[PDB]
Amino acid sequence: MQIFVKTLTGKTITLEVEPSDTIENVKAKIQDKEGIPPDQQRLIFAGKQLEDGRTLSDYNIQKESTLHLVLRLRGGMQIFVKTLTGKTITLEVEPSDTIENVKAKIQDKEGIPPDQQRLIFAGKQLEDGRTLSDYNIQKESTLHLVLRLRGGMQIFVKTLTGKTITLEVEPSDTIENVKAKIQDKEGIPPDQQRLIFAGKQLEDGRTLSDYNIQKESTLHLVL
Amino acid sequence: SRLNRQLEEKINDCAEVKQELAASRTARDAALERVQMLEQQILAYKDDFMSERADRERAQSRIQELEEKVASLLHQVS
Amino acid sequence: DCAEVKQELAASRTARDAALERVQMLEQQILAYKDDFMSERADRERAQSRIQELEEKVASLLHQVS
C-alpha cells in the first residue's frame, strides 16, 4: 500500500509501505527519499508521536493515510569538525554513517565538495569507505579538516559571450547542482540558464554520469 | 423524465455558495491543522534546545574538571 | 437567495483568517526557539574548543612533571 507524509514546508511525500512496517522503517524510507536522518524525524498520526519500535498497523494506519513530519534541529549524536581557521563545525551524524556521508554533510553545511575534503582523526586520514564506528569515532569526538583547492574531475562551461569557466564536479552530480555551481561562480540563476551538451537539453534530474559526461568535457550554456 | 430535471435543479440550487462553503471549510481546517503542527514544531525545537543545553552543561563540567587537573599539575612544580 | 449558506461561508472565512494570524505568531515563536538552539550550539562549540585547549595543556603538563 501507499501512504502520504505532510510537512510544514508544504511538501507531501508519497511512500510505498506495508502494514507490518515499523515507524523506524518508514523513517528510513523518508531518509532514502528526502535525505533526512531517522533520529531527526518526528512522525505524527492521530495526535500520537509514533514510536520507532511499533508498526503502522499498531496505529491503525490504513491505505492512503496521512502522517505529519516534524523536523528536529539535532539528532542523538554530534561530531565536531575542526578547520584551520578556528571555527568548530558541528555535524549531526549516526554511527552507521560512512566518511563519504560525513563529507556530504560538510558539503551541505559549508558548500565544499567531498572529494576536496581531507578528514583526519587521531592522526589518521579517514578513508571514504569505513564508517564512523570503524575509527571508534565516539560522540563529540573531533575530526580535523584539510582543504583541497581542486577535486578529481573538472568540466568547462562556455557562456554565449565566448567566456568559458572551469568547474569542480563529480559523476553523481545532477544538472541542477551543476547549474548551482554556475550560479555560484558566474552568478546566473538556475532558472534562467539552460545547459546544453551533445546537442541536447540537459534535464535537472539527470546526473552527469547519465549523459556520461567525462572529465575535461565542455558544456555549452545558454539562456 | 422529471427526476432528471429535479436532479440538475437540486445540484444547481445555490450550488456556487455551497461549493464556496466547502472549499472555505477545507481552507479553514487546513489552517487550524497547520496551527497544531506549528505547535508541535515549537515542542520539537524546545526539545532540541533542552538537549543542547544538556550537552553544553556536560562540556562545562568537563572544562571544570580539566581546569582542576591543570591547577593540580601546576601545583606539582614544587 | 440562500442567505444561510452565505452566513456559514462568512463564518468559515472568519475562522480561516483568525487561524492564519495565529499561524503568524506561531512562526514568530518557532524562530525564537530556533535562535535559542543556534546560540546554545555556538556556546557548546566554544566550550568544546576550550576542552581541546585544556586537554593539550594537561598532556603537556603531564609531559613536564613526568
Closest CA to C51 of B34, A104, B38, B56: B56
What cell does A15 get? 511512500
Contact A145, A83 (CB under 8 A): yes
Residue A27 CB partners (closer than 8 Å, separation 6+): A38, A41, A43, A52
Distance from CA of C8 to the nearest CA of A (A): 28
CB contact under 8 A, C45 and A88: yes
Within its chain, how far is the Cα of B2 from the centroid?
54
Cβ partners under 8 Å of residue A71, min gap 6:
A7, A8, A36, A40, A41, A42, B41, B44
Question: How far is Cα A56 from Cα B46, in angstroms, rounded to an integer?
Answer: 27
Taking the C-alpha atoms of residue B33 and residue B21, their distance in angstroms, rounded to an integer, is 18
Say how far apart CA A12 and CA A169 lie, in whole Å.
31
Is residue A178 within 8 A of residue A167, CB to CB? The reply is yes
What domains lie within chain A, and their CATH numbers? 2-71 (3.10.20.90), 78-147 (3.10.20.90), 156-222 (3.10.20.90)
**If we measure between CA atoms, which residue out of A205, A199, A201, A193 comes closest to residue A167?**
A193
Q: How far is B19 from chain A (nearest CA, A)?
A: 24
Interface touch A88/C48, C-beta < 8 Å: yes
Which chain B residue is nearest to residue A10, measuring alpha carbons?
Answer: B34
Q: Who's near C47: CB < 8 A, 6+ residues apart?
A: B56, B59, B60, B63
Chain CA centroid to CA A138, Å: 22
Confirm or reject contact between C4 and chain B (CB < 8 A): no
* Domain spans in chain B, listed from the N-terminal domain onward: 1-78
Task: Provide the edge-to-edge strand list for the sheet that holds A41-45.
Answer: A12-16, A2-7, A66-71, A41-45, A48-49
| Alpha carbon distance A194, A219 (integer Å) | 11
Q: DSSP string covering chain C, please?
A: --HHHHHHHHHHHHHHHHHHHHHHHHHHHHHHHHHHHHHHHHHHHHHHHHHHHHHHHHHHHHHHH-
State the best of A77, A80, A83, A91 to mutate against chain C, taking most chain C CBs within 10 Å.
Answer: A80
Q: Tell me, yes or no, if A71 comes closer than 8 A to chain B by beta carbon.
A: yes
Question: CB-based contact (8 Å) between A191 and chain B?
Answer: no
CA-wise closest residue to A53 among A77, A30, A21: A21
The most distant pair of C-alpha atoms in chain C lies apart, rounded to whole Å, by 98
Distance from CA of B36 to the nearest CA of C (A): 9
Q: Are A60 and A53 in contact (CB under 8 A)?
A: no
Neighbours of A201 (CB within 10 A): 10
Q: Determine the Cα–Cα distance for residues A146 and A82; give it in Å rounded to an integer.
A: 9
Helix (H, G, I), strand (E, B) or coil at A110: helix
Method: X-ray
Query: What distance in Å separates the CA atoms of residue A132 and residue A98, rounded to the nearest whole number?
Result: 6
How many distinct helices (H) and strands (E) make up chain A? 3, 15
CB contact under 8 A, B45 and C34: yes
* Contact by Cβ (8 Å): A129, A99: yes
In units of Å, what resolution does this entry have?
2.6
DSSP bridge partners of A197: A200
* CB A23, CB A35: distance < 8 Å: no
Of A82, A77, A114, nearest in space to A99 by CA? A114
Alpha helix segments (H runs only) across B1-78: 2-12, 15-75
Q: Rounded to whole angstroms, how far apart are CA atoms A67 and A17?
A: 13
CB contact under 8 A, A68 and B40: yes
Report the C-alpha gap between B21 and A208 in whole angstroms.
Answer: 50
The rounded distance, in Å, linking the Cα atoms of A64 and A39 is 25
